[PDB]
Design a protein around this ligand. Structure first.
Ligand SMILES: COC(=O)[C@@](C)(NC(=O)c1cc(C)n(-c2cccc(C(F)(F)F)c2)n1)c1cccs1
Length: 265
């Protein structure tokens, strides 16, 4: 149901116009400097999956709580299928840049023969054909026409794909550390300190943007609900427009190719 406040419904309209117009105007310019090599496809399909997920959401959320509107059982679930298929096509893309950066230090001899363009152009096809086959899937407390046996399906997939990202960046910081002993001290503390101040920022902008909201969404299935948790889920849902703005500050800015190609044109 739709009860937040009459008082806390006049600041989100100003907040979503400043955390909503930059994420459009940054994920567009990033796709205006792409150049294309088979690990720059995976960074491209999460700069197009965060320009669509920030228009359907900013149009539905400003419609449902501030100035009011009603719907039906087939009109409403169609707009809800455009924020469910665009928030798991922005997490499955974070699962492909952490499986591409894992077959480059674990088997560094084979990264120009395993990961080729015939297996990196079909790979993002088999995510957009599973994320719209589990978001049209309703063929059948806070989400109106949704039964509780379906919120134990979406959370149980988005959680196990965030436990292959906090393992695929804690094996690059162990393999580049034992290696750091030999080709520095014996070989001729230099290499594992330039990968320990960017690789800690990727894991502290992910656990504070998929950890509060994936906890409240468990408190429905895992027991009773109440009144004051319905008013704080409407501010714990604007974190998704915070983890759409910082993504081209961590993946596009932190490079030597995308920052020099920009400089020349
Ligand atoms: C109560 O809903 C809403 O009024 C809105 C504003 N939507 C949200 O508030 C919202 C906020 C978030 C973070 N999600 C989300 C994201 C992924 C998956 C799921 C689900 F449904 F599969 F569990 C939900 N939905 C929408 C109305 C019409 C389209 S959206």
């Amino acid at each position: 149901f739709m009860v937040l406040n009459p008082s806390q419904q006049l600041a989100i309209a100003v907040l979503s116009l400043t955390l909503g117009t930059f994420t459009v105007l940054e994920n567009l310019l990033v796709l205006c400097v792409i150049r294309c090599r088979p690990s720059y496809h995976f960074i491209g399909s999460l700069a197009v999956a965060d320009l669509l997920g920030s228009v359907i959401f900013v149009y539905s959320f400003i419609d449902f709580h501030v100035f009011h509107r009603k719907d039906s059982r087939n009109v409403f679930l169609f707009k809800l299928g455009g924020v469910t298929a665009s928030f798991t096509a922005s997490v499955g893309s974070l699962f492909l840049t952490a499986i591409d950066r894992y077959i480059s230090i674990h088997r560094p001899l084979a990264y120009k023969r395993i990961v080729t363009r015939p297996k990196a152009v079909v790979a993002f096809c088999l995510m957009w054909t599973i994320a719209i086959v589990i978001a049209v899937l309703p063929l059948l407390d806070i989400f109106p026409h949704i039964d509780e046996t379906y919120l134990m399906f979406w959370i149980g997939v988005t959680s196990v794909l965030l436990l292959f990202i906090v393992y695929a960046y804690m094996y690059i910081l162990w393999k580049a550390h034992s290696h750091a002993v030999r080709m520095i001290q014996r070989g001729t503390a230099r290499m594992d300190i330039r990968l320990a101040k960017t690789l800690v920022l990727i894991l502290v902008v992910l656990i504070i943007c998929w950890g509060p909201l994936l906890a409240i969404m468990v408190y429905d299935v895992f027991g009773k609900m109440n009144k004051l948790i319905k008013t704080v889920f409407a501010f714990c849902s604007m974190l998704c427009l915070l983890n759409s703005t910082v993504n081209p500050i961590i993946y596009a800015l932190r490079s030597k190719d995308l920052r020099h190609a920009f400089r020349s044109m």
